[PDB]
């Protein structure tokens, strides 16, 4: 005879290891663990917006867009648990390479303010590659929206997403620079 079913607060990072609520700052593609326990012990998992994310069998979260949906896990004895995902104040999507000024405009002048912006990602959610969606990169360099003085040096600096190399003077015409966006 089966106790209450329920899908545990506390997620399970899948890049750093870390467990903890659902980090209120998002990168795209990033993925996580839902522990459901209770019922027959046998889950099924099921999302009801694949658009904003995505759950699999074992229950293992994919971040896909920005938005709130709804995970839910069904037992054998026939019970029912929905886990809500909250928008995230920022989500963090990575497009094409582009120098600077090409890239500004890409993410629609939404780059990242600041290298925090993006330092507490990494903090977060860990090497970006830990993940399904970019496991083919050692890097992933992205440029920081540049200070006003930078600006008239034709520079900016730059931050990556697996190994958080900090890049000061970077000249906006520098290939091989991911345009990552902040909506």
């Given at each position: 005879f089966f106790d209450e079913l329920k899908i545990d607060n506390k997620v399970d990072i899948i890049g750093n290891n870390v467990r903890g609520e659902l980090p209120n700052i998002w990168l795209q593609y990033g993925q996580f663990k839902l522990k459901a326990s209770g019922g027959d012990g046998t889950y099924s998992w099921y999302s009801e917006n694949t658009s904003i994310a995505t759950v699999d069998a074992s229950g293992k979260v994919t971040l896909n867009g920005k938005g709130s949906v709804v995970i839910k896990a069904t037992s054998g004895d026939k019970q029912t648990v929905s886990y809500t995902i909250k928008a995230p104040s920022y989500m963090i999507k990575v497009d094409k390479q582009a120098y600077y000024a090409d890239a500004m405009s890409i993410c629609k002048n939404l780059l990242?303010?600041?290298?925090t912006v993006l330092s507490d990602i990494y903090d977060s959610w860990?090497?970006?590659?830990?993940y399904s969606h970019y496991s083919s990169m050692n890097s992933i360099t992205a440029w920081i929206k540049q200070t006003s003085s930078e600006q008239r040096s034709g520079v900016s600096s730059t931050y990556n997403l697996i190994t958080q190399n900090p890049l000061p003077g970077v000249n906006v015409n520098t290939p091989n620079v991911y345009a990552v966006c902040v909506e």
């Open positions: 990242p303010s600041t290298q860990g090497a970006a590659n830990k």
